[PDB]
């Protein structure tokens, strides 16, 4: 007996102020958070249908540790396209995740957020190359316009599913 | 790329007047058809979620032939619990399906319809034994009360999934 | 920020064979279970809308009390509301309701626990517990009574939704 | 520009105690009301899909037991005429509810469905065939319902919407 | 007995041509109206889920009066970010609403529409200060791109809910 | 007896690389495909509600030929706003459709895709005039941002419905 929808534990990581919370609140509440209130730790749930399968996303929004990294099945690694340092930090978030999961192949999506802003310092091609080198998808997002937001979370679920088979 | 929901081709068979159409219309329109208008052939579609999977049911409602039996992925074999003859006919519907599919193991559910009526002539235990001998589920239904209607169709989808 | 739907932890209790599992599987899978496979402990989830509010039901399906357990009290202590199920053709299951209710009051350490009384198997002709008797019992406890059939689906949604409504009243 | 779903104004009428409220609450809340609390006037809304069309049912639940009566009957687009299958008198009253509706709508052809409620109860006094003949003589559908078991409940309301749609074409 | 979903009566006001109709049609039909057909009065309904609660939005789309303002529970005050005059008019729409509701505290959201256009004449900071002075939310929208559209309406519903408690 | 939702057979046509596949996958999977994998032929289904009517979209995604054009009830004619040649080709796609349907009045929507790109070579007004000359709607889309994607498909369904009455 099927006992209820499949649950997926997703974790959003990345440097302070890249828009991890804004992405998540946009997904859950269809609301853009304009204020910058730094996060300690928040969790959110949403039921969605992805590729014809109903599921429950349990999303942990982190601060810019080993316990959440151990329980998470997939990770959104978020940088801001106008902050080169946030992009350089991605490497370290990814190594930390691989270390705590004790694995080379953890479901992950690279997210370049704030793509609505004119002040771009990270080229799409650079981020795409970085993602290709990790063998993971790259998505450009804006929590403000909602560009790529659903896609980033759904793509992560699809990565988790590929990794379970 | 997933191209849209899974489709299941379901066929409802059994003797004239057992309630094949009424079952189907109850599923699709939430409507009990009181009149008896014999069917030639009708098809119906419905999108439902079963065990967390979205699917598109394509349901062929038959008359009390080889082409529909060949394209169908699963069969509801319907008799009426107040008509012993309709129950005896099940064996023949099942052989015909096995012959046309050239298969011993075709997804199938045995459906005893009109369970709301007081004139029962087929015992549940007899129908359960028949179903057990075929290795298929048995469900009692009423197109009038809606008892078992969803369950019969959803169980058939689950049988199709096991067989894939 | 609202962080996602409200969750309600429901526990289904009552004597062995009254239809606790059948009720739950009928809710979750729209399927009537004809076989009797005794439960140790099983849990289920379902998202529903009740009174315009989306919620997530976490349902714990328990065993008939046969004997002592410290593990029993722990799982029962997680419930916010309880369906107390008897079978309308089994007078003993109805008499046991009192003991299920005392067990719940003891483990929740409370006199006022959201609860619904469920008389299952109402499709059967062999009725031994009258509707009026069960209604009077429920009235004496100050809780709703619902007659159900896991087979026909009569009252099944209503029993679970009514329990959610009781939980909501108790939170306000 | 389509401006949002189609709205249908439905009115439930019939003798005191036939189950008008219980039918409506069963539709709206999936809840059977066991108590008998007489209604003055209540309205309820529900969005449903019927034959692939999304609509908003605005349902007026009336009293069995008078300027207010004419107003609801005038705004209503379709009527469920409910009797209880164990109460012959409620069945005899149906004719008069139908005439009252025709009078208040000032029309001979009002979308209507005949509903025989309490079909779960053993003490049936109105035969199905009698009710079917009455409905046939009016040219309207007949549905047997139980607010307790939910038998026919959706069907009664959906069938009324289908009647309203036929009457608008 | 709960009688069906909660209903919210919303009114969209603001100067001629700011995009009141376009916002509303985008919400209801997922359609961008490119033509400018001036409105007399139109009403629209939509059922949505906001913060886990199902509700029925009844939306009155107004022309560039006391009766609609009296029955409305919340107001979207819309200006266009490329039209300074529409922004200056907001003050008058707000005073008119306060006068007709006989209230200092009416649920309201300030909407800066046409944020897809390059020809911006109202600074975000100015609009944010105006909204802060009124104690109401500010949202930038585009009926064309759909940026902020759901958020503007849902935020107004959230304001109405806060005001009912 | 209504036998289940209305089905609409939609065909997406236009020059190689304009984003026909990306538009369709964005509609079906909420996913932007960044790679360019040329299509031979693919079909997709989706149930949606448009103007209160539930329907089943059967969408044929074509390559940059008589059989699909004969079974299709409506056509999205897609060009890319940074590719003038794709825009000039529209005329020929439209003639090919009229020829195979043997009809002067085939439901059709003109779609200007890639409207997120800065390298615009086709003016919106030119495309609108072309659409006006055909008596069909014009919609600007981005498969990347999702701007106009639902609108393009829904508008085509509305065109199909007008043509059936
Ligand atoms: N323009 C624009 N602003 C954004 C975007 N995402 C976030 N912001 C803004 O960036 C600021 C920081 O956003 P926030 O979500 O708090 O970032 P964070 O990554 O969660 N910070 P922390 O790790 O401290 O919790 C906010 O003021 C927010 O409005 C975006 O996509 N576009
Ligand atoms: N009481 C009751 N009557 C039923 C039920 N199912 C069907 N009927 C009645 O049985 C009669 C025949 O039903 P119908 O659906 O036409 O049966 P069918 O198998 O499709 N006949 P055919 O093979 O001629 O198409 C109808 O008068 C119908 O109302 C049921 O479950 N209970
Ligand atoms: N006729 C009828 N039979 C039912 C109903 N509900 C349950 N049953 C039957 O009663 C038997 C016991 O049901 P089950 O759900 O396993 O009972 P349970 O309370 O979970 N037993 P346990 O406490 O051992 O887990 C099964 O054969 C089942 O089909 C009902 O409403 N009607
Ligand atoms: N068994 C059974 N009882 C029903 C059904 N419908 C209503 N009842 C019961 O009959 C009584 C009357 O129901 P109610 O819905 O209040 O009737 P009404 O037509 O709305 N009365 P009024 O006209 O005074 O508002 C209640 O006790 C109710 O539980 C039904 O289908 N079955
Ligand atoms: N670029 C862009 N154009 C817009 C936007 N919103 C509206 N428009 C355009 O602005 C014009 C006026 O829009 P309309 O919705 O009719 O505005 P309105 O406030 O309802 N006018 P009125 O008060 O006369 O009824 C239309 O041409 C429309 O396409 C937007 O967000 N972006
Ligand atoms: N920036 C942007 N790129 C897009 C958009 N739509 C498609 N593309 C890009 O353009 C390329 C071609 O898209 P694709 O859908 O394969 O084009 P097509 O019309 O189906 N090509 P074919 O006819 O060979 O099948 C891909 O690289 C894709 O990412 C869009 O709206 N914006
Ligand atoms: N629902 C509360 C829990 C808290 O901890 C969580 C940890 C992870 Cl990795 C994901 C979701 C979570 O949700
Ligand atoms: N949708 C039209 C088709 C026609 O033929 C069908 C064949 C089967 Cl087995 C099932 C459903 C069918 O429906
Ligand atoms: N007279 C016919 C009998 C009974 O019913 C039958 C049904 C089928 Cl599908 C085939 C053979 C049969 O044999
Ligand atoms: N003698 C009857 C027994 C007493 O103890 C019981 C305890 C429970 Cl929780 C339930 C039923 C019981 O039945
Ligand atoms: N929704 C407010 C209305 C007012 O009066 C009503 C009249 C009818 Cl026929 C139906 C529903 C009603 O409720
Ligand atoms: N549903 C029709 C009504 C007409 O008048 C309205 C008045 C307001 Cl404030 C809001 C919505 C409206 O819509
Ligand atoms: N700015 C000059 C006018 C003054 O009066 C106004 C009143 C309203 Cl409600 C709207 C716009 C107005 O603008
Ligand atoms: N169901 C598969 C079909 C194949 O041919 C199709 C033709 C059209 Cl115009 C649309 C969708 C199609 O999908
Ligand atoms: N640019 C001229 C070519 C000619 O042949 C074509 C055929 C089609 Cl279906 C569309 C565009 C074409 O473009
Ligand atoms: Mg944060
Ligand atoms: Mg038939
Ligand atoms: Mg059990
Ligand atoms: Mg009443
Ligand atoms: Mg307007
Ligand atoms: Mg392609």
Residue numbers in the entry:
A (entry chain C), E (entry chain E), F (entry chain F): -3 to 60, 68 to 168
B (entry chain D): -3 to 60, 68 to 167
C (entry chain A): -3 to 168
D (entry chain B): -3 to 61, 65 to 168
Excerpt from the paper describing this PDB structure:
Our structure-based approach has produced compounds that bind to mutant KRAS with sub-μM affinity that interfere with RAS-effector PPI and endogenous RAS-dependent signalling in human cancer cells, and show a correlation between in vitro binding and potency in the cells.
A truncated analogue of Abd-2, designated as Abd-3, also binds to KRASG12V-GppNHp, but with lower affinity than Abd-2, showing the intrinsic binding properties of the benzodioxane core. Protein crystallography was used to determine the KRAS-binding site for Abd-2 and for the truncated analogue Abd-3. Analysis of the compound Abd-3–KRASQ61H complex (crystal form I) shows the best electron density in chain B. The ligand terminal NH3+ makes H-bond interactions (salt bridge) to D54 carboxylate and to a well-defined water molecule (430) that is in turn also co-ordinated by an H-bond to D54 carboxylate and the hydroxyl group of S39.
